[PDB]
Amino acid sequence: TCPFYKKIPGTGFTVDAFQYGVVEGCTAYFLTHFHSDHYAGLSKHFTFPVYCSEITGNLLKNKLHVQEQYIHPLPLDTECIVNGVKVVLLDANHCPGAVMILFYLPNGTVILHTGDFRADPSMERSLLADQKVHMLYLDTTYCSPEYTFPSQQEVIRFAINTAFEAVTLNPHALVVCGTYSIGKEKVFLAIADVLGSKVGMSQEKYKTLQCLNIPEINSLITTDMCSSLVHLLPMMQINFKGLQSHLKKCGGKYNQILAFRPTGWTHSNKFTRIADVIPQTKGNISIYGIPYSEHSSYLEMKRFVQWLKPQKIIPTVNVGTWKSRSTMEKYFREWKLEAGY
Ligand code: NI
């Protein structure tokens, strides 16, 4: 059944709740972003109102075939009325089209639902600065102090410098980057820009990227693999067997692969700096795991929460075990005692 942390009290609304059938009492289904664990259940047979960003709405229409009459896109940073209730959509600094949702309840309560987010100090100057938030529905993916990772800018600098050195030393090297969802497009776009290439990919992945409103996208990507020296493959093919196989397919155009796997966190983060990362190598194939995150580090999450000073926190990630729930609740109380709210 639908868990309580997916329901917005005092409303007929749910958030990211499409896999439970008809949720009794729901008049509007919000979708924070186009990742499969969140849209699970949506298809061309859905007949209730879906509220989302413009970009998520493009993906619903083109990839899932949801009918246009049920897609309700909202502009960002704009007060809108939905079924009698004032709401605002804010950029979540996650994947393209991802939003946080501010609900202004008829009784005076204000609720922020972060969806999935990577907290940033820029959020402290959005429309959130302008009133008190009582209840926070929080993306707690990395809510433990071991989870450190570098800025996205540091990670892209590392990837650009590595790829440009390798291809200038060997003009017959191919660069491959893994993907299995939207998000993290800066990794493959920044590398192709330094190399003067388009990125090549499957017809399915090109269609997906053409829904994202990225400026000048026609100048940056292609379905013609032969013209490109940055290829995108499914994340499942980013291993020595998959990559040796791919190299066979390129008809002797290339004699070396340098591949990137943008993971979330991995425990080499507790010891190793970005400057010091090394690849796994077999023969003429090298694979780099780079810690490019689209979720908050522990410290970024803690700063956001201590700034916002909510009255009540409801975690939306890691809620399935008693040990995880107790750990999280201990951090929330630490933060509240340190900052004095
Ligand atoms: Ni996500």
From Swiss-Prot:
Cellular localization per UniProt = Nucleus
Q: In which tissues is it expressed?
A: Expressed in brain, heart, kidney, liver, pancreas, placenta and skeletal muscle.
Domain of life assignment: Eukaryota
| Reported induction | During mitosis. The mRNA encoding this protein contains an internal ribosome entry site (IRES) in its 5'-UTR. This 5'-UTR generally suppresses translation while specifically promoting expression during mitosis, when cap-dependent translation may be impaired.
Per UniProt, what does mutating H295A do?
A: Impaired nuclear focus formation, reduced interaction with PIAS and increased sensitivity to cisplatin
- List the signal peptide residues: none
Please give the family membership noted in the entry: Belongs to the DNA repair metallo-beta-lactamase (DRMBL) family.
Name the job this protein performs. May be required for DNA interstrand cross-link repair. Also required for checkpoint mediated cell cycle arrest in early prophase in response to mitotic spindle poisons. Possesses beta-lactamase activity, catalyzing the hydrolysis of penicillin G and nitrocefin. Exhibits no activity towards other beta-lactam antibiotic classes including cephalosporins (cefotaxime) and carbapenems (imipenem).
Query: What is the protein's quaternary organization?
Result: Binds constitutively to TP53BP1. Binds CDC27, which is itself a component of the anaphase promoting complex (APC). Binds PIAS1.
Protein known as: DNA cross-link repair 1A protein
- Species source reads Homo sapiens (Human)
**Organism taxonomic ancestry:** Eukaryota, Metazoa, Chordata, Craniata, Vertebrata
Q: Which gene encodes it?
A: DCLRE1A
